[PDB]
């Protein structure tokens, strides 16, 4: 199978299936669409006390209303985040408006699976996209293979099976914001290994009336102590 330019006798992706396998080792993250707004969470998996917690990036800021989360390999995510930032600014250049999140993720998956060493390798990252377009809030999930789809509440990376199962247990269409936030961090502290405290996780919530500051900073402590 050795090589990105040879199919299988059956239906194997190989140069891509091994990437979809390479997603699974990363840290988990959970984003949930609600009509009130999109919330999002992640686990850092802090190793050392010297490991400064605010320097690890999982949620970065693409636009004033477009958030993100990464997975697995760090630097392919850095490449895609850099280019995604550049292209939304190009959209604002030629259109005086905000590139909507579906158009953002199509713009990413134009080259999210475009790996060619001649005429480079496929990328090793899963991405969770949340944003507020004209149609309200949106939650979006892509993959290394560019097979981009909308998801109402997608969970990635490690332990995503039980995350999806226990997520489909509690979720429905007419949920609220804070209920989904604590339902997410319940799933988090069922799938993490360490004690849930101020430094493990970080939230990212975007509202149509609260487009700015898609983050909660140590009021997250108050959210965790309410469980």
């Amino acid at each position: 199978d050795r090589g990105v330019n040879t199919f299988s006798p059956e239906g194997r992706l190989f140069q891509v299936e091994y990437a979809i396998e390479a997603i699974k080792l990363g840290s988990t993250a959970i984003g949930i669409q609600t009509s009130e707004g999109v919330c999002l969470a992640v686990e850092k998996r802090i190793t050392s006390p010297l490991m400064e917690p605010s320097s690890i990036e999982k949620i970065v800021e693409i636009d004033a209303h477009i958030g993100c989360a990464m997975s697995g390999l760090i630097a392919d995510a850095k490449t895609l985040i850099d280019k995604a930032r550049v292209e939304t600014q190009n959209h604002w250049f030629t259109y005086n408006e905000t590139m909507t999140v579906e158009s953002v993720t199509q713009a990413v998956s134009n080259l999210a699976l475009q790996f060619g060493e001649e005429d480079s390798r496929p990328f090793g990252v899963a991405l969770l996209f949340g944003g507020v377009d004209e149609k309200g809030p949106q939650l979006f999930h892509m993959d290394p293979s560019g097979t981009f789809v909308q998801c109402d509440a997608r969970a990635i990376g490690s332990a995503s099976e039980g995350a999806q199962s226990s997520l489909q247990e509690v979720y429905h269409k007419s949920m609220t914001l804070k209920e989904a936030i604590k339902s997410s961090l319940i799933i988090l502290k069922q799938v993490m290994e360490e004690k849930l405290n101020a430094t493990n996780i970080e939230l990212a919530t975007v509202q149509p009336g609260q487009n700015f500051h898609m983050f909660t900073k140590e009021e997250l402590e108050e959210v965790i102590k309410d469980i």
Partner: protein
């Protein structure tokens, strides 16, 4: 076309006219000359509309990229420098552009002046345009550093009134912008004839 800017203790004052002629013929009366780059930057239009508009929009693009990469708001001198570096690459090919750069800094007030000839310089007072000398005259009459707010408003407004009263290439609405520590704030939009009735006596 006559713009001016001067900084003082309480931030920066920016005023401009709104007339943009075409030779001897006036096109419009309400040309918004002070191009709003950011919620913390204000660029102007000083010689040529399209050139100033394009290069300041591209500068705004670059500034937004810079902030989203560093999570830290750009300085004023860096933006003026980036504009001068982008403008210098077409020297001699016929660019007319004499804009001004204003904004608030970690250092505080910031006031730079970028030409199509690339004369990036700091300073405290500037004025660009055909009838800029009139504004220089009455402004360097009324200038100080310890001025009040309404004093500076009346100074700039009187200055632009004198400029449009004497010059032929100036007129239209008198804009007046005020750069603060937090962000810029539009003051008022006053017509020439209203100022003529008010200040003629």
């Amino acid at each position: 076309t006559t713009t001016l800017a001067f900084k003082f203790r309480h931030g920066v004052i920016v005023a401009a006219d709104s007339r943009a002629t075409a030779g001897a013929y006036i096109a419009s009366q309400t040309v918004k000359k002070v191009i709003e780059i950011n919620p913390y930057l204000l660029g102007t239009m000083a010689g040529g509309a399209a050139d100033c508009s394009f290069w300041e929009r591209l500068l705004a693009r670059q500034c937004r990229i810079y902030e989203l990469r560093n999570k830290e708001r750009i300085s004023v001198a860096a933006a003026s420098k980036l504009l001068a570096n982008m403008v210098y690459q077409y020297k001699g090919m016929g660019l007319s552009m004499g804009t001004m750069i204003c904004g608030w800094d970690k250092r505080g007030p910031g006031l730079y002046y970028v030409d199509s000839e690339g004369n990036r310089i700091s300073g405290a007072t500037f004025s660009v345009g055909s009838g800029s000398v009139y504004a220089y005259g009455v402004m360097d009459r009324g200038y100080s550093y310890d001025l009040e707010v309404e004093q500076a408003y009346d100074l700039a407004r009187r200055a632009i009134y004198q400029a449009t009263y004497r010059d032929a290439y100036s007129g239209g609405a008198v804009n007046l912008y005020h750069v603060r520590e937090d962000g810029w704030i539009r003051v008022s939009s006053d017509n020439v004839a209203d100022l003529h009735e008010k200040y003629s006596g």
